[PDB]
Amino acid sequence: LTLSQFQKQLLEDYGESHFTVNQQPFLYFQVLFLTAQFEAAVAFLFRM
């Protein structure tokens, strides 16, 4: 596992429909921010 594979796996291969984003939004923000995907985490959080 590289960090780059894990970043993609959360953002593209599981995504907002796995992390039930409309019920646990801070958990998907946490998943992206703790994987250092800060730009994607902001471009998620700013939709809500």
């Binding site: 960090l3 801070f26 923000f29 946490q30 921010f33 994987t35 250092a36």
Partner: protein, 145 residues
């Protein structure tokens, strides 16, 4: 009231007419910022003024996190996580893509993410034990073991 309203010529009281109606704040523009966006905008005012007056650049993490010490605990822990993930000894390069692509800084993001997740589970194990002390049998010995 009738004695003051007979007073300007001969009673001696300090009212050159009654007050100007409520007139304290400078013009609020009718304002569409809410309580939280106004508290943030005030912390950005407190940030920009220090740069404009040539002061030491303050930590913007603590100026923003002190707007989450108010209402929503999940926004307080979100700012605690953002703080732990911005606590990084960044080499002062002219390029954010080089720093975000460094092996060393990508190790540091994972080292801090693991430290956050470990202290999260340390808080959860503390609260689980202190909520159940009669089952837990904690005794008088401090330490993670």
């Amino acid at each position: 009231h009738t004695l003051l309203a007979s007073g300007e010529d001969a009673l001696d009281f300090t009212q050159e007419s009654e007050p100007s109606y409520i007139s304290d704040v400078g013009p609020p523009g009718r304002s569409s910022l809410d309580n939280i966006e106004m508290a943030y905008a005030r912390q950005i005012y407190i940030y920009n003024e220090k740069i404009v007056n040539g002061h030491l650049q303050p930590n913007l993490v603590d100026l923003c996190a002190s707007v989450a010490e108010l209402d929503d605990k999940s926004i307080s822990d979100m700012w605690t996580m953002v703080k732990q993930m911005t606590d990084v000894l960044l080499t002062p390069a002219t390029d954010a893509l080089k720093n975000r692509s460094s092996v060393e800084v990508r190790m540091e993001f994972v080292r801090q993410a693991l430290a956050y997740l470990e202290q999260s589970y340390k808080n959860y194990t503390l609260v689980t034990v202190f909520g159940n002390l009669h089952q837990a049998q904690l005794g008088g010995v401090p330490g993670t073991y």
